[PDB]
From Swiss-Prot, chains A, B, C, D, E:
Compartment list: Cell membrane; Basolateral cell membrane
Membrane topology, as annotated: Multi-pass membrane protein
Protein's UniProt name: Bestrophin-2
Catalytic activities: chloride(in) = chloride(out); iodide(out) = iodide(in); hydrogencarbonate(in) = hydrogencarbonate(out); L-glutamate(out) = L-glutamate(in)
UniProt activity-regulation remark: Chloride channel activity is allosterically inhibited by GLUL/glutamine synthase (GS) which affects the gating at the aperture in the absence of intracellular glutamate. Inhibitory effect of GLUL is relieved upon increasing of intracellular level of L-glutamate.
Organism the protein comes from: Bos taurus (Bovine)
Main localization of the protein described in the UniProt heading: membrane
Protein's gene: BEST2
GO molecular function: bicarbonate channel activity; chloride channel activity; intracellularly ligand-gated monoatomic ion channel activity; ligand-gated monoatomic anion channel activity; ligand-gated monoatomic cation channel activity
Range covered out of full length: 2 to 366 of 512
Amino acid sequence: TVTYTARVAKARFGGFSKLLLLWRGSIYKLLWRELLCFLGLFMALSAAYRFVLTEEQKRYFEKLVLYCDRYASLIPVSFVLGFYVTLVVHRWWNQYLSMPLTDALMCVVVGTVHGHDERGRLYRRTLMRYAGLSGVLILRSVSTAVFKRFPTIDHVVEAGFMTREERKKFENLNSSYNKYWVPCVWFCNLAAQARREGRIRDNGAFKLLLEELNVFRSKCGMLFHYDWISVPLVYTQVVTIAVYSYFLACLIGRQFLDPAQGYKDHDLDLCVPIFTLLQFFFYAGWLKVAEQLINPFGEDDDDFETNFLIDRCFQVSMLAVDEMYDDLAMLEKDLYWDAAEARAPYTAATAFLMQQPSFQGSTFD
Amino acid sequence: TVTYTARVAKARFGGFSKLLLLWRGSIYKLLWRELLCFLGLFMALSAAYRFVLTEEQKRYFEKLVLYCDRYASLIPVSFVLGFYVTLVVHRWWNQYLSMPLTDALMCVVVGTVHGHDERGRLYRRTLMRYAGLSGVLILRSVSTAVFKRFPTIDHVVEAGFMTREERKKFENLNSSYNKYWVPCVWFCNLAAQARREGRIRDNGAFKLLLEELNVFRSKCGMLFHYDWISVPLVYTQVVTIAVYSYFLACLIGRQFLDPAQGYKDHDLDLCVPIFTLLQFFFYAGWLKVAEQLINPFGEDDDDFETNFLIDRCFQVSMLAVDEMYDDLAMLEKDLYWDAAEARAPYTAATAFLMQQPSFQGSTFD
Amino acid sequence: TVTYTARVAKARFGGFSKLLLLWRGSIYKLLWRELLCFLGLFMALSAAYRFVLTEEQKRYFEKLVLYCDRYASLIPVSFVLGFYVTLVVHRWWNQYLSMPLTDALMCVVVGTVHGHDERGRLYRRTLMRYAGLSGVLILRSVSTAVFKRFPTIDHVVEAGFMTREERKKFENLNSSYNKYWVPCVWFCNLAAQARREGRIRDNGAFKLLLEELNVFRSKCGMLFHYDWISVPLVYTQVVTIAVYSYFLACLIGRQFLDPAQGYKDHDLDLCVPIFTLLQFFFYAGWLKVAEQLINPFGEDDDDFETNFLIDRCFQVSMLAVDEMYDDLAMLEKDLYWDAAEARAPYTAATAFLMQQPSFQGSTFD
Amino acid sequence: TVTYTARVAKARFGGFSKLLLLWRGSIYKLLWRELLCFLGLFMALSAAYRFVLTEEQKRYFEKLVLYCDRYASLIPVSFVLGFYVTLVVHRWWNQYLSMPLTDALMCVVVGTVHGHDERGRLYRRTLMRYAGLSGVLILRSVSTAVFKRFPTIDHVVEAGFMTREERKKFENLNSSYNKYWVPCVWFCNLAAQARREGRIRDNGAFKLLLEELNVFRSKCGMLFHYDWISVPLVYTQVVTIAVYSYFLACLIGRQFLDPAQGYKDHDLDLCVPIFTLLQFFFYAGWLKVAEQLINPFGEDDDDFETNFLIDRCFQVSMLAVDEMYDDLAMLEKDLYWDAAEARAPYTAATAFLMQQPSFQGSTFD
Amino acid sequence: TVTYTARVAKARFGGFSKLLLLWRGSIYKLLWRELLCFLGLFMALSAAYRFVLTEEQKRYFEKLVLYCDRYASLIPVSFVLGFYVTLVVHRWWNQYLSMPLTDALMCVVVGTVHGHDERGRLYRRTLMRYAGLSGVLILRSVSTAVFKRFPTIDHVVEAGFMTREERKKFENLNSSYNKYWVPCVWFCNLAAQARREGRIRDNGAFKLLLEELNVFRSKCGMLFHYDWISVPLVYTQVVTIAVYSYFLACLIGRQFLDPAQGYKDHDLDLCVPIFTLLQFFFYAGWLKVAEQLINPFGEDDDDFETNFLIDRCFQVSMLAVDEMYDDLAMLEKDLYWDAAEARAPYTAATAFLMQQPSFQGSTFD
Ligand SMILES: [Cl-]
């Protein structure tokens, strides 16, 4: 993920123009190889028209250039690109929200599974580790970044996500399908055991764990839906054909013709097609937005940081259910306990800006 | 389903252009018959203008060609196609999410229905089989792929989805409407029995089963909504009329006229309409995106694998509620039980890439 | 509802072109009266220019035709139509999903209200009849198809939806507003009675009934929201003005002028405006998509089958809570009870097509 | 609200053209003042060119007219208007759904708060009155229609929404923010009291009241979100600048030039710009769709009937929880109690239309 | 936030034109520096063509101007801007709804945590303060307005959001990730303590607190998702390149050429490009809509008032759970207790407008 949120906090004079100076996660990185190949074909096709062609063939070349320039219909592609890109951005934001996060699970686990003894801590840690084990097992199937970190199940055991004994019970399961769902069934059996043993003091507390685990498992099942069912291949090929056929019309249709011929609209030579190379940055770059977001789980710079999230989830969920289990500060009276209004102060950079009138509704003038 | 997710994990130089080399699930498979019929009508209409017509009729043919070329309004159709296609892709992704999956049901069933004896395993397996029976019964009504596998109810009994005794109770039900809902009522009676017999130890556990069964049944009821109510026929006919009337204007409006006539914009012969056949790949291919997704339950290559899902659901749901019922590994201390931070390692292909600074928020520079 | 789902299960050579041969629920049925009035005004305006006008008035008529042809701006309307139509299709699919269905209610009622005696069957049937009574009472207010079947409340009593005694309690309620909500309050009093009498054995079972009844009532309340608040009238008048003002520009701007005048672009006579009548099928037909879906509850062929749904709901909900109450087949061992994998067979038309490799994720090459 | 739902139930020959005859809630009411000002500036600018200008100044005026006619780019604005209008219609439909309705609350209150005595009726009525008090207090802040009915809190006490004693407790609350949330806290204290006193017989019944009250309060909190955060002002000013700068190009760019000058495209005089005034109805009317829906809570004809809803909610919620508390008709056997199929009849206008085949799925030919 | 909701309550003659007179939160504030730089480059490029260039170089300059005017393709950018802006407005409205609000939490806390003694008030106030502590801790990471008010954790302790003892337990937590989640774990331990001590009298009351806390925490977790994952940088650079390359074509392509040259479309001088500067207000202003909403948490005038919300939330949540705990007015009979219809009156400005017929449905003529 390339975060530039702090760069556009204000809307100043260099608002969005300053981000064109950025290289990491940018369009120039994604386009410069196709950009030199587009210009290299243009300069070769121009240099042929200046030296190697004859006077008969040049007049034939001139009529071909005016033919292709008519079929450079840039208007239509700007709809197929926009609808398709919006479809790709919609699946990409929804792939991010289906990332297996255990924050909802850990707040239930610390509040409902009980016990300061060695069995109380083991119930809670194993419950959070089973959630995180499924999260590794769904991310190693959809993320090549996660998969290069856990290429085998032995790596998952080495990482401590699975124990050697659990792997014996894992690999002796007879199923030909992906078994990321297996620690979720292990989760429901550990929660059913602790309810029977009274570590879960309540039946409603037990229902909450199974409610929030299925939310977790449906997020893992949603990442399998996106990985299996991509944007349909025909709609990807239809969008790519229209963009690349528009730049075949520009490769011929924008060639600089001989001024001594007196052609309409064709009498000026820039020797470099500046506005065609800028239109190339537009349309090939607009399509490269979809090529970058269609598989957001790789190793490139703007991709999701799945491995960092896995570390953040295992660290926080152990910390919350072991070190933070029933470790509260003593109940003290707050600083506005005996106050009419509870009003926290402002700093000197925020006092002189926030004397504004409080909104009460639009009918109170 | 044609999965090409692994082909676009990186955004390299051959980003989307490599998918134009793909044949299975592609646009060339969907279009090549209409493409040769479009070119065959163009070559016949051109060859008439070169040999069989007279000099009087050719001048009449020339004015007809410039007439039709004015009415080739490609701009407008690129809106009717985009809005209609987005409408078809929206119904198609939502048809996929309404697929009857039993993963939420099996995690509740293994955690709440109890008993290692022969009656405990029968309660749980019959509960998951009733869910899967409705799933076969809704998919044989909407999927010709599923229906060719289960053409009769005898096939469903042969497949073991229904028992002979249940079919007696099934076929003696007096109803003229589709009875896919029937094992869901059978489900609520089996769950009410096991709550009365104490296999379901809790009232909140009983409510969770009925909560998650109605989620399952509403997904089956959603697949009946899409099968009954398609994209409206008038809006399908309006989109198809505009695309096919645009290519009647191209069939005449793009004919290669006699250069010795000196017509404006009509003096060059390619003998094959290259940019009109590429525009045909655009607009007939953009419409063929909607024709492929309007009924995603058939046997074609990019359709949903409904039969594979039925096998995956019956196998996993038996495995989870029979072999995995109360079969836990022993509670062991984890590898980070006595660690301050729980930090799993990286492989050598992921260590040198993930030394990046951790995000703390955009206000912490 | 005109269902053509089975016609487009494959994407073959006659993909969408075969639906242009369809008459019921089609665009030709919705347009042919306006189409002959458009052509009849064109043929009258042409025949005036050929016989009744003089040579002075024809030259004045010619300049008016080139004036209107400039203002035939077909591009802009293709946005106002697409956004407005998408807005109408969005409300129309959401009007369908708010149809009062009792499937969620009947699965709770058979699982929670108990008793094989005469009082047990009466509790359950009256609970499902009160849900269906509200459903008739909301559909007779929004559907002229349902209203022509139940023009009075006497018809609802005759249909058995309301008893004569309930109508006494119904019509003596002092309220000036629509009372479709009244059997929902009758529902919550019947469920509160059976919980007090112990027919509902559980407090969590009681909460589930009131949870799923408010879902039902909110769907009935959603159909009152759409019936009261249509697409806003100004946005309907703005879209209709733009389409009809475009075809006033075509009625004059596409007239066939005298070839002996030598006008640019105006020298060819087809005597029938083929591409203008096809553009009329486009734009008047695209607007007729919205006119057909703006009130989907009538009697026309593509409208929702509300009356059929009412019969389907009353039949299934009586069958589920009376004949299917606690009528289970005996718990038998299934055909894969002693199997490692539970694998149902394929037919001969599905065996040779589904030997495909199972998807495990996109990172497992 | 101007309801025209009954006018478009069929799609007949005068489908949408009949709504152009409508005046109340229409575009002609919203535009006719700006329309005469547009035409009055056009007729003044034309009459200057015919009489007061000289022959030198007219030739200067002619070149200015052809300059502005080039910059009348109607295409681009039709995107800024469509996206912005769709954004305004999306917020407007969601402002309607956040209207404080008590139907979900009253069905829970009649089913869970108990008691036929004077204290039982007071618990239930005060619970529904506290919900309705917040609904008045949120609507008087966002609706000038509601605010002109309740300009002070004394008016709310006079209306009986608040008692004099509650207003003492209301106005002695020390808070500078809008206190519409205050009867919702009063609600949770009344429900907690009746659970302690046993009027609420169940803990699950108590949780349902607090569940459905927060749904009610979040709808009131959503109406404060829309009232505070409108469509952003810069995006409103960008859309308005583009529409009004297009009609400055039409005010000059469509002037009728002297025919004796022989200008291209400028030789015909209609003395009234018919197609420019129709384009004005298009673009100023399309923008007036957003100006009418951006604040839907006023007193104009197509605005929401908030005051009528407040009366409908207070009347129905008293009727349901006082007159309809435990007032059921006796449990009778229904008319299809001893029937195999329960089939209600059709009237003569619905019998001959609904002999259609029942849908069983698209795979059953 | 610049609220102009009260200015557009009616749709009068100065409907949206009056908002072009507004300065605070407007487009003129966001654009006037780029607008003078665009005009300053235009006036310098014009003044070079009038004085410093020679007659040879001016003829070369003239052909460059007609070259760039062809590539001023304003149509295509109006799609890339609309789709991208709609994407930015969609994330911006969803960033607002994820603001940490404690209204749902405080209604549960006052209804479920019990006790008038000093320990009862401390349980409730500390529960609402822990929710508000996370809300400060998530807003200081994403809002530079909130962060300038709380630059350190000492400021949070000084503000009374954290106690000195809690900060000891806060800063000794071993985690490298942002710890805004920490008082949510503190919340679940305080609620689990009060359930064990019987201040929470019910198990269902305990489940409701943990249900509504995870809703609160997921809103805080959603604000971290938007802050980390912005609009992708390539799609921001593609939109900015297209807008700025269009105005490089206008900077040259709209220059006023010498009239004595007789160029087509280039013979008129306004000495100020009025319609190009208005198109600049359109396209640079349409892009400045996205630059203002892409980071809505700053200090600019139309940004969200996060600091005001923090004060509003801490004040209301203390008031509701301390001063308003079990402080009800006595149960009185209401003003319509003995009335058939409960009908509140109208004022004189609302009586003469609301005699309209009550809607009963669209089928009741
Ligand atoms: Cl619950």
